[PDB]
């Protein structure tokens, strides 16, 4: 979360600790995203920081265009897999872990998002809304 995130976010189950790799779901040239940090996460001895739906992470691209590899950039988690629970009572989950590469302000690097996108992320990051097909 943080910059450019207009909205607050209700807690959702943390799915992705540091080291996790999600699918890159944009058209940027990136094939996956390797999580090295979660923004706005706190501190407890021994705890991995771990992201969830609509969290902004800091990632590198393990697989993808060489102009994207070997460096750290912001991304946003768009699909989960660890099931979480909404305030309408529902426990839901996607089939994959996936997020999209983005700028500190929260602008997509790419122009499409392939696959669905959870609403809690859509609601959080307007330029993500824009590029989303099926939401939730």
């Amino acid at each position: 979360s943080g910059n450019g995130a207009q909205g607050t976010k209700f807690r959702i189950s943390l799915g992705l600790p540091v080291g996790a790799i999600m699918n890159c779901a944009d058209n940027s040239g990136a094939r996956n995203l390797y999580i090295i940090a979660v923004k706005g996460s706190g501190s407890r001895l021994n705890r991995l920081p771990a992201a969830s739906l609509g969290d902004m992470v800091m990632a590198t691209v393990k697989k993808g265009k060489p102009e994207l590899r070997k460096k750290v950039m912001p991304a946003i988690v768009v699909r989960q897999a660890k099931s979480w629970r909404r305030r309408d009572g529902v426990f839901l989950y996607f089939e994959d872990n996936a997020g999209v590469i983005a700028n500190p302000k929260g602008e997509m690097k790419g122009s499409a998002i392939t696959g669905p996108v959870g609403k809690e992320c859509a609601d959080l990051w307007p330029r993500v809304a824009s590029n989303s097909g099926v939401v939730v």
């Binding site: 009572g89 426990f91 839901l92």
Partner: protein, 78 residues
Amino acid sequence: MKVEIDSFSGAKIYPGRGTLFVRGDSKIFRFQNSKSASLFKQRKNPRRIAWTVLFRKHHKKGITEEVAKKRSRKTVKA
């Protein structure tokens, strides 16, 4: 408040209850429980599992009174 239904088993899913699965395509599948849920992950075919609605429908089980006549018609002349 909507009572959704089990996309594997045919059961009513009253609120906050069972699980919701958003697949690759964006096809959403809703389960009443881990049973329908696992049979699902197991690529089991509901029309072959005796207790499901879908299976009962296809096998014409205990329908009886639906395929028993009704009475609904009129007569005008104006």
